[PDB]
């Protein structure tokens, strides 16, 4: 019966996913900023080559 009554459940997974979203979003923004900085520097290395 427990899988059925386990439907009776609290909201904590949604806020945990909200935190996961925020952490991943900030990391991906940092990664893309560093990527674009490195890419512009690489284009300057092309000019120097």
């Amino acid at each position: 019966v427990k899988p059925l009554l386990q439907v009776s459940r609290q909201e904590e997974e949604m806020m945990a996913k909200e935190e996961e979203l925020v952490k991943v979003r900030e990391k991906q923004l940092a990664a893309e900023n560093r990527l674009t900085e490195m890419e512009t520097l690489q284009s300057q290395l092309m000019a120097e080559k």
Binding site: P3, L4, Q6, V7
Partner: protein
């Protein structure tokens, strides 16, 4: 009182998800006025007084004609499961239609759909497909995905 479709509860319990069972059983809690779970005509009449007011006695009598006297939620869930037995999931039908479609996207043209439904021994008829057209989005050739059809069938977003 009780009646027993034992095979129906067992199978349909396995067929549904705990989330879908939550939808069904919580809806049946919404029907009942009692706190024990015994649905009966007056319970449904209070639901109708909340959503779809002033029915004739014919509505509740026809419901009782389907639902054999007072009902518990497991009997109610199996009354629904009898209608639900062999319902293909909405994800499955959307993905099948996407694989069928030559645009690989799940779109369909009005006459192409009409033929596909009707043709080579398929039992559909002109009004049978016209019923689908009235359930369809605004243009019957309108490149709409089958997400709309499953949305109106399920009345749910997932």
């Amino acid at each position: 009182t009780k009646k027993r479709p034992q095979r129906a509860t067992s199978n349909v319990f396995a067929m549904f998800d705990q989330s879908q069972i939550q939808e069904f059983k919580e809806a049946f809690n919404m029907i009942d006025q009692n706190r024990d779970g015994f649905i009966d005509k007056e319970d449904l009449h209070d639901m109708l007084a909340s959503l779809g007011k002033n029915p004739t006695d014919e509505y509740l009598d026809a419901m009782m004609n389907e639902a054999p006297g007072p009902i518990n939620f497991t009997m109610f869930l199996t009354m629904f499961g009898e209608k639900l037995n062999g319902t293909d999931p909405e994800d499955v039908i959307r993905n099948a239609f996407a694989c069928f479609d030559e645009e690989a996207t799940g779109t369909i043209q009005e006459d192409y759909l009409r033929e596909l439904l009707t043709t080579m021994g398929d039992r559909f008829t002109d009004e049978e497909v016209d019923e689908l057209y009235r359930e369809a989005p605004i243009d019957k050739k309108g490149n709409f995905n089958y997400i709309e059809f499953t949305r109106i069938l399920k009345h749910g977003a997932k």
